[PDB]
Amino acid sequence: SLTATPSRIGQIMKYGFPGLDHVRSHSDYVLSYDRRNRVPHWVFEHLTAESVAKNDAVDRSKCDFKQDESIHPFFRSQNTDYRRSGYDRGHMAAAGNHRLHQKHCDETFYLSNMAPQVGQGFNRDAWNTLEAHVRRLTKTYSNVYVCTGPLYLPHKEDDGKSYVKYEVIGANTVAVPTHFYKVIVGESADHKLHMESYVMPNQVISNDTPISVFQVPPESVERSAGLLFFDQINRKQLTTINGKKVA
Protein backbone atom coordinates (compact mmCIF):
# COMPACT_ATOMS: atom_id res chain seq x y z
CA SER A 1 0.00 0.00 0.00
CA LEU A 2 2.48 2.64 1.19
CA THR A 3 5.23 1.73 -1.31
CA ALA A 4 5.36 0.46 -4.90
CA THR A 5 3.71 -2.98 -4.83
CA PRO A 6 3.99 -5.69 -7.52
CA SER A 7 0.22 -6.33 -7.39
CA ARG A 8 -0.55 -2.59 -7.77
CA ILE A 9 1.85 -1.95 -10.66
CA GLY A 10 0.21 -4.90 -12.45
CA GLN A 11 -3.19 -3.42 -11.60
CA ILE A 12 -2.26 0.04 -12.94
CA MET A 13 -0.55 -1.43 -16.05
CA LYS A 14 -3.36 -3.92 -16.77
CA TYR A 15 -3.64 -2.91 -20.43
CA GLY A 16 0.09 -2.78 -21.23
CA PHE A 17 3.04 -0.41 -21.19
CA PRO A 18 3.08 2.54 -23.65
CA GLY A 19 6.90 2.30 -23.72
CA LEU A 20 9.81 1.06 -21.64
CA ASP A 21 12.11 4.07 -21.27
CA HIS A 22 13.29 4.55 -17.69
CA VAL A 23 10.07 3.23 -16.11
CA ARG A 24 9.60 4.00 -12.43
CA SER A 25 6.85 3.00 -10.00
CA HIS A 26 5.40 5.05 -7.19
CA SER A 27 2.79 3.89 -4.69
CA ASP A 28 -0.21 4.81 -6.88
CA TYR A 29 1.10 5.77 -10.33
CA VAL A 30 3.67 4.64 -12.90
CA LEU A 31 6.15 6.98 -14.62
CA SER A 32 8.36 6.72 -17.69
CA TYR A 33 10.99 9.48 -17.46
CA ASP A 34 12.47 11.26 -20.47
CA ARG A 35 16.08 11.96 -19.38
CA ARG A 36 16.77 14.04 -22.50
CA ASN A 37 13.82 16.39 -21.96
CA ARG A 38 13.83 16.33 -18.15
CA VAL A 39 10.04 15.55 -18.03
CA PRO A 40 8.00 12.33 -18.26
CA HIS A 41 7.50 10.45 -21.51
CA TRP A 42 4.21 9.37 -19.85
CA VAL A 43 2.51 8.57 -16.58
CA PHE A 44 -0.14 5.91 -15.99
CA GLU A 45 -2.98 5.89 -13.45
CA HIS A 46 -5.81 3.60 -12.47
CA LEU A 47 -8.57 5.59 -10.78
CA THR A 48 -11.56 4.49 -8.77
CA ALA A 49 -14.24 6.54 -6.97
CA GLU A 50 -12.45 5.65 -3.73
CA SER A 51 -9.02 6.82 -4.87
CA VAL A 52 -10.17 10.25 -6.17
CA ALA A 53 -12.54 10.90 -3.27
CA LYS A 54 -11.76 13.83 -0.97
CA ASN A 55 -10.04 12.45 2.10
CA ASP A 56 -9.71 14.40 5.36
CA ALA A 57 -6.51 12.39 5.91
CA VAL A 58 -4.91 13.95 2.82
CA ASP A 59 -3.61 17.49 3.30
CA ARG A 60 -2.21 18.75 -0.01
CA SER A 61 -0.78 21.77 1.86
CA LYS A 62 1.91 19.51 3.36
CA CYS A 63 3.23 18.83 -0.17
CA ASP A 64 6.10 20.67 -1.85
CA PHE A 65 7.78 20.45 -5.25
CA LYS A 66 11.05 18.55 -4.80
CA GLN A 67 13.90 17.05 -6.85
CA ASP A 68 13.72 13.30 -7.52
CA GLU A 69 16.91 11.77 -6.08
CA SER A 70 16.31 8.45 -7.77
CA ILE A 71 17.15 10.25 -11.09
CA HIS A 72 20.86 10.68 -12.04
CA PRO A 73 21.91 14.34 -11.31
CA PHE A 74 22.55 15.01 -15.05
CA PHE A 75 18.89 14.47 -15.89
CA ARG A 76 17.01 15.98 -12.92
CA SER A 77 14.80 19.00 -13.22
CA GLN A 78 15.18 21.43 -10.31
CA ASN A 79 13.02 24.19 -8.83
CA THR A 80 15.71 26.61 -10.14
CA ASP A 81 14.77 25.61 -13.73
CA TYR A 82 11.11 26.64 -13.32
CA ARG A 83 11.58 29.75 -11.16
CA ARG A 84 10.54 32.84 -13.11
CA SER A 85 10.44 30.81 -16.33
CA GLY A 86 6.90 31.90 -17.17
CA TYR A 87 5.74 28.31 -16.61
CA ASP A 88 4.07 26.32 -13.87
CA ARG A 89 5.43 23.03 -12.54
CA GLY A 90 2.58 21.03 -14.07
CA HIS A 91 1.63 17.62 -12.66
CA MET A 92 1.33 14.82 -15.19
CA ALA A 93 -0.20 12.52 -12.55
CA ALA A 94 -2.44 15.04 -10.72
CA ALA A 95 -2.30 15.27 -6.93
CA GLY A 96 -6.12 14.98 -6.80
CA ASN A 97 -6.09 11.56 -8.45
CA HIS A 98 -4.26 10.09 -5.43
CA ARG A 99 -6.09 10.54 -2.17
CA LEU A 100 -5.97 7.09 -0.56
CA HIS A 101 -3.03 8.24 1.58
CA GLN A 102 -0.87 11.32 2.24
CA LYS A 103 2.23 9.68 0.71
CA HIS A 104 0.37 8.76 -2.51
CA CYS A 105 -0.30 12.48 -2.97
CA ASP A 106 3.20 13.51 -1.75
CA GLU A 107 4.76 11.38 -4.47
CA THR A 108 3.03 13.39 -7.25
CA PHE A 109 5.14 16.39 -6.19
CA TYR A 110 8.47 14.98 -7.41
CA LEU A 111 9.79 17.22 -10.17
CA SER A 112 10.14 14.10 -12.33
CA ASN A 113 6.31 14.10 -12.49
CA MET A 114 6.38 17.71 -13.76
CA ALA A 115 6.46 19.45 -17.11
CA PRO A 116 6.43 23.18 -17.87
CA GLN A 117 2.85 24.25 -18.43
CA VAL A 118 1.26 27.64 -19.02
CA GLY A 119 -0.37 28.61 -15.71
CA GLN A 120 -3.40 30.87 -16.04
CA GLY A 121 -5.48 29.60 -18.94
CA PHE A 122 -4.08 26.05 -18.90
CA ASN A 123 -2.53 24.24 -15.87
CA ARG A 124 -4.78 26.20 -13.50
CA ASP A 125 -7.84 26.24 -15.76
CA ALA A 126 -8.51 24.26 -18.99
CA TRP A 127 -6.07 21.42 -18.14
CA ASN A 128 -7.53 21.16 -14.61
CA THR A 129 -11.00 20.95 -16.24
CA LEU A 130 -9.85 17.83 -18.12
CA GLU A 131 -8.34 16.40 -14.93
CA ALA A 132 -11.63 17.05 -13.08
CA HIS A 133 -13.58 15.35 -15.93
CA VAL A 134 -11.43 12.20 -15.74
CA ARG A 135 -12.09 12.03 -11.96
CA ARG A 136 -15.86 12.49 -12.55
CA LEU A 137 -15.72 9.57 -15.04
CA THR A 138 -15.43 7.30 -11.98
CA LYS A 139 -19.14 8.01 -11.39
CA THR A 140 -19.84 6.37 -14.78
CA TYR A 141 -17.10 3.73 -14.87
CA SER A 142 -16.05 1.75 -11.80
CA ASN A 143 -12.46 1.76 -13.04
CA VAL A 144 -10.82 4.48 -15.12
CA TYR A 145 -7.37 3.96 -16.64
CA VAL A 146 -5.48 6.98 -17.91
CA CYS A 147 -2.20 7.75 -19.63
CA THR A 148 -1.04 11.37 -19.60
CA GLY A 149 2.04 12.79 -21.39
CA PRO A 150 3.76 15.51 -23.46
CA LEU A 151 3.92 15.99 -27.23
CA TYR A 152 6.25 18.09 -29.36
CA LEU A 153 4.30 18.69 -32.58
CA PRO A 154 5.61 20.13 -35.89
CA HIS A 155 4.45 23.28 -37.63
CA LYS A 156 5.04 24.57 -41.16
CA GLU A 157 7.38 27.49 -41.85
CA ASP A 158 7.82 30.08 -44.67
CA ASP A 159 10.25 27.76 -46.50
CA GLY A 160 7.44 25.17 -46.83
CA LYS A 161 9.31 22.77 -44.56
CA SER A 162 8.02 21.37 -41.23
CA TYR A 163 9.84 21.86 -37.93
CA VAL A 164 9.45 20.87 -34.33
CA LYS A 165 10.37 23.79 -32.05
CA TYR A 166 10.16 24.15 -28.26
CA GLU A 167 11.62 26.28 -25.50
CA VAL A 168 13.92 24.65 -22.98
CA ILE A 169 14.13 26.32 -19.58
CA GLY A 170 16.87 26.69 -16.95
CA ALA A 171 20.43 25.36 -16.72
CA ASN A 172 18.99 21.85 -16.93
CA THR A 173 17.25 22.67 -20.22
CA VAL A 174 13.82 21.37 -19.21
CA ALA A 175 11.70 20.97 -22.37
CA VAL A 176 8.47 22.94 -22.76
CA PRO A 177 6.06 20.60 -24.57
CA THR A 178 3.88 22.02 -27.38
CA HIS A 179 0.84 19.93 -26.29
CA PHE A 180 -0.28 17.31 -23.76
CA TYR A 181 -2.61 14.30 -24.14
CA LYS A 182 -4.78 12.07 -22.00
CA VAL A 183 -5.80 8.69 -23.34
CA ILE A 184 -8.47 7.07 -21.18
CA VAL A 185 -10.33 3.74 -20.92
CA GLY A 186 -13.36 3.26 -18.68
CA GLU A 187 -14.77 -0.15 -17.76
CA SER A 188 -18.57 -0.16 -17.43
CA ALA A 189 -20.66 -2.46 -15.20
CA ASP A 190 -21.10 -4.93 -18.05
CA HIS A 191 -17.81 -5.91 -19.66
CA LYS A 192 -17.80 -2.98 -22.09
CA LEU A 193 -14.77 -0.79 -22.63
CA HIS A 194 -14.99 2.90 -23.56
CA MET A 195 -12.07 5.03 -24.73
CA GLU A 196 -11.59 8.81 -24.70
CA SER A 197 -8.55 10.73 -25.92
CA TYR A 198 -7.70 14.43 -25.84
CA VAL A 199 -4.83 16.61 -27.06
CA MET A 200 -4.63 20.15 -25.67
CA PRO A 201 -2.06 22.77 -26.66
CA ASN A 202 0.30 24.07 -23.97
CA GLN A 203 -0.97 27.65 -24.26
CA VAL A 204 -3.60 30.01 -22.86
CA ILE A 205 -6.98 28.43 -23.65
CA SER A 206 -10.25 30.32 -23.22
CA ASN A 207 -12.23 29.39 -20.05
CA ASP A 208 -15.42 28.92 -22.09
CA THR A 209 -13.84 26.30 -24.38
CA PRO A 210 -15.38 22.88 -23.71
CA ILE A 211 -12.87 20.01 -23.42
CA SER A 212 -14.88 18.09 -26.05
CA VAL A 213 -13.30 20.26 -28.77
CA PHE A 214 -9.92 18.74 -27.88
CA GLN A 215 -10.97 15.17 -28.65
CA VAL A 216 -8.67 13.44 -31.18
CA PRO A 217 -8.54 9.86 -32.57
CA PRO A 218 -6.24 7.82 -30.26
CA GLU A 219 -4.17 6.63 -33.26
CA SER A 220 -3.19 10.21 -34.03
CA VAL A 221 -1.94 10.58 -30.41
CA GLU A 222 -0.03 7.29 -30.84
CA ARG A 223 1.54 8.40 -34.10
CA SER A 224 2.60 11.76 -32.59
CA ALA A 225 3.86 10.35 -29.27
CA GLY A 226 5.82 7.36 -30.53
CA LEU A 227 3.83 5.23 -28.06
CA LEU A 228 1.06 2.64 -28.17
CA PHE A 229 -1.72 3.00 -25.58
CA PHE A 230 -3.81 0.16 -24.21
CA ASP A 231 -1.94 -2.30 -26.47
CA GLN A 232 -3.70 -5.25 -24.75
CA ILE A 233 -7.06 -3.97 -26.11
CA ASN A 234 -7.95 -4.62 -29.76
CA ARG A 235 -9.65 -1.36 -30.86
CA LYS A 236 -12.32 -3.45 -32.60
CA GLN A 237 -13.45 -4.58 -29.14
CA LEU A 238 -14.00 -1.10 -27.72
CA THR A 239 -17.65 -0.10 -27.43
CA THR A 240 -17.15 3.64 -27.93
CA ILE A 241 -14.30 5.97 -28.78
CA ASN A 242 -14.83 9.61 -27.85
CA GLY A 243 -18.56 8.92 -27.44
CA LYS A 244 -18.86 7.27 -30.85
CA LYS A 245 -20.01 3.64 -31.33
CA VAL A 246 -17.49 1.11 -32.69
CA ALA A 247 -18.64 -1.44 -35.29
- Which of the residues 210 through 239 are near a second copy (CB under 8 A)? 219, 222-228
The binder of a second copy chosen from 173, 203, 212, 237 (CB under 8 A): 173
79 labeled part of a ligand binding site? no
Q: Is 165 among the residues that bind another protein (CB under 8 A)?
A: no
CB of 174 to a second copy, least distance (A): 10
Distances (CA, A) of 33 to 23, 67, 72, 90, 149: 6, 13, 11, 15, 10
**Binding-site partner at residue 34 among another protein, a second copy, Mg ion, none, CB < 5 to 8 Å by type:** a second copy
- Min CB(163)–a second copy separation in Å: 5
Q: Any known ligand binding at 234?
A: no
Closest to 169 measured CA to CA, from 64, 90, 227: 90
In the three-class reduction of DSSP (H, G, I as helix; E, B as strand; rest coil), residue 201 is classed as strand
- Residue 212 binding target from another protein, a second copy, Mg ion, none, CB below 5 to 8 Å by type: none
Query: Please, is 5 exposed, middle or buried when counting C-beta atoms within 10 Å of its C-beta (0-12, 13-18, 19+)?
Result: middle
Tell me how far, at minimum, the Cβ of 192 lies from a second copy, in Å: 26
Q: State the Rg of the chain over Cα.
A: 17
Among 67, 143, 215, 239, binds another protein (CB under 8 A): 67
232/154 Cα distance (integer angstroms): 29
Contact between 88 and a second copy by CB under 8 A: the answer reads: no
- Type of residue at 219: E
Distance CA 186, CA 134 (A): 10
Regarding 175 and contact with a second copy (CB under 8 A), the answer is yes
Asked if residues 177 and 115 have their Cβ atoms less than 8 Å apart, the reply is yes
Smaller CB distance to another protein: residue 62 or 139? Answer: 62
Can you tell me the distance from the alpha carbon of 116 to that of 119, in angstroms, rounded to the nearest whole number?
Answer: 9
Which residues are part of the catalytic machinery?
91
| CB of 89 or CB of 182, closer to another protein | 89
Q: How far is the CB of 176 from a second copy (least distance, A)?
A: 9
- Tell me the binding residues for Mg(2+): 123, 131
Detail the residues annotated as belonging to a binding site.
Answer: 123, 131
